[PDB]
Design a binder for this molecule. Structure first.
Ligand code: 4XM
Length: 150
């Protein structure tokens, strides 16, 4: 019973989380996952500020209200070469990665590793935070509050 959470640097508190190396998070699970990081889904304004501080990914993820990809540099295989906060308009499907916003993070780029999942609850799952530099932090717990996600 294992979940891996790959996390990015934070930019103005905003970061990206990918579950188990594939698009696999529902909107309800996304909210719960951010809550486990003492975080919330970012607003569009929070995401725009993060983008301005250097945040970009090549992955769709939830924010409050939309599914987006922040892009700084045009790349043909990331958000169809767009820059800015690219908003997904048309999709059949419901599972993506997520973004999260931590108000207590530093104001600009924080590329230190994440070494805690401070608001996980008691549970049976081995949850492993995986940083981009490979450093890991694991704990037994749960974060999902909706049965249809479990
Ligand atoms: N942040 C982090 C921490 C630990 C592991 C990983 C990450 C970030 N993942 C980046 C995934 C990028 O995939 C792109 C999307 C499709 O085009 C190829 C690149 C790759 C795996």
């Amino acid at each position: 019973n294992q979940i891996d959470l790959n996390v990015t640097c934070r930019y103005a508190g905003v970061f990206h989380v990918e579950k188990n190396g594939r698009y696999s998070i529902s909107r309800t699970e996304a909210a719960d996952l951010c809550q486990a990081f003492n975080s919330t889904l970012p607003t569009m304004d929070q995401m725009k500020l993060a983008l301005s501080k250097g945040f970009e990914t090549c992955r769709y993820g939830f924010i409050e209200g939309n599914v987006v990809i922040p892009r700084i540099h045009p790349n043909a295989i990331c958000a169809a070469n767009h820059t800015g906060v690219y908003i997904l308009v048309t999709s059949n499907t419901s599972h993506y990665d997520t973004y999260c916003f931590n108000a207590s993070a530093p104001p600009e780029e924080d590329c230190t590793s994440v070494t805690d999942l401070p608001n996980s609850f008691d549970g049976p799952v081995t949850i492993t935070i995986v940083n981009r530099d490979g450093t890991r932090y694991s704990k037994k717990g749960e974060y999902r509050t909706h049965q249809e996600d479990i």
